[PDB]
Amino acid sequence: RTRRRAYLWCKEFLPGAWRGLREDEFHISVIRGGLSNMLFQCSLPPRKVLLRLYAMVLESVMFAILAERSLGPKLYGIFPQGRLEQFIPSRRLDTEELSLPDISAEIAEKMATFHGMKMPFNKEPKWLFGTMEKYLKEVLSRIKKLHKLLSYNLPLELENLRSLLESTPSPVVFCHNDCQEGNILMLIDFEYSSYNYRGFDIGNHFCEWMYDYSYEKYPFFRANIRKYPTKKQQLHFISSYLPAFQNDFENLSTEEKSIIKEEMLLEVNRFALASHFLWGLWSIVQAKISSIEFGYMDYAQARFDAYFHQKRKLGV
């Protein structure tokens, strides 16, 4: 029987009707069936709950806290396999919805709210170039494809970037770091969340207009470089973002306002380069150490070609 454990958690953690409720009447339905996150719609007929099984205290102290602040589902029980999580009738929102004005703004301000937070995690801005440096080292028909990636001269370019981004001031704030369409229901899943350059969070969100992972045929993803936010679009994100992040912002002069936004367009767009390089690196390492399923070298090539395309567009 599929419900093998399941019943045992829901009876034990959820109070009231779940307290006595016999096994003959435990109704569970699968929602997502993953190798490192299975989802389940356990209920009774808190009437329904979301079971989510399969160094990191981060994305569980995080989840808790957002459940305290009404900005995430409630935490109805936690245990070393997963958690029982409030069910909210909801769905992942697909890549094509991100450009909507309705949804875009919201995300911009929610990401501003997120960056606003002050949290009990390491504040040393290590995550970005510490991870990238580790992966580049690690890296050094597949055998074939890797060469074409490595022929780009990744070690050099990585310091070319270190240079470029070190010239680009970006405030250090608690970033989500994976703010793409499949993590917005409300903004969820903090696997890779940490303190980081705000630039990365945004630019990585922009990069994310290009890639759709809703896929069951290899390579399991689609890339549309002609789908990155336009200038007007970017600005508009930033201008739903700034007033949600700086209380002082709305009363600045237009030269002040305009100067910021001008400077922030440069910021997030140079950081978008980091998103291509980080994830490009990440993907290659997964083409080896992955029990998941995806087209990781293809994804790599996609991320890298963007990266070189990207930096031609910027001209520096």
Ligand X SMILES: Nc1ncnc2c1ncn2[C@@H]1O[C@H](COP(=O)(O)OP(=O)(O)O)[C@@H](O)[C@H]1O
Pick one of ligand X, its own copies, none as the site partner of residue 88 (Cβ within 5 to 8 A by kind): ligand X
Q: State the residues that interact with ligand X by CB under 6 A.
A: 31-32, 34, 37, 39, 50, 73, 85-88, 90-92, 182, 189
CA distance 297 to 281: 10
Nearest to 76 by CA among 93, 91, 64, 62: 64
Does residue 78 interact with its own copies by CB under 8 A? Answer: yes
- Binds its own copies (CB under 8 A): choice among 5, 27, 32, 123: 123
Least distance from its own copies to the Cβ atom of residue 73, Å: 12
Q: Determine the 3-state secondary structure of 269 from DSSP.
A: helix
Pick one of its own copies, ligand X, none as the site partner of residue 55 (Cβ within 5 to 8 A by kind): its own copies
Residues in 79-98 that interact with its own copies by CB under 8 A: 79-80, 83-84
Residue 239 burial (CB count, 10 A): 17
Least distance from its own copies to the Cβ atom of residue 74, Å: 9
Least distance from its own copies to the Cβ atom of residue 122, Å: 5
CA distance 222 to 205: 16
Give the pairing of strands 172-175 and 194-197. antiparallel
Nearer to its own copies, 7 or 228 (CB): 7
Nearest to 272 by CA among 211, 225, 203: 203
Among 30-38, 73-81, 270-278, 289-297, the segment contacting its own copies (CB under 8 A): 73-81
- Answer whether the bond into residue 219 is a cis peptide, omega within 30°: yes
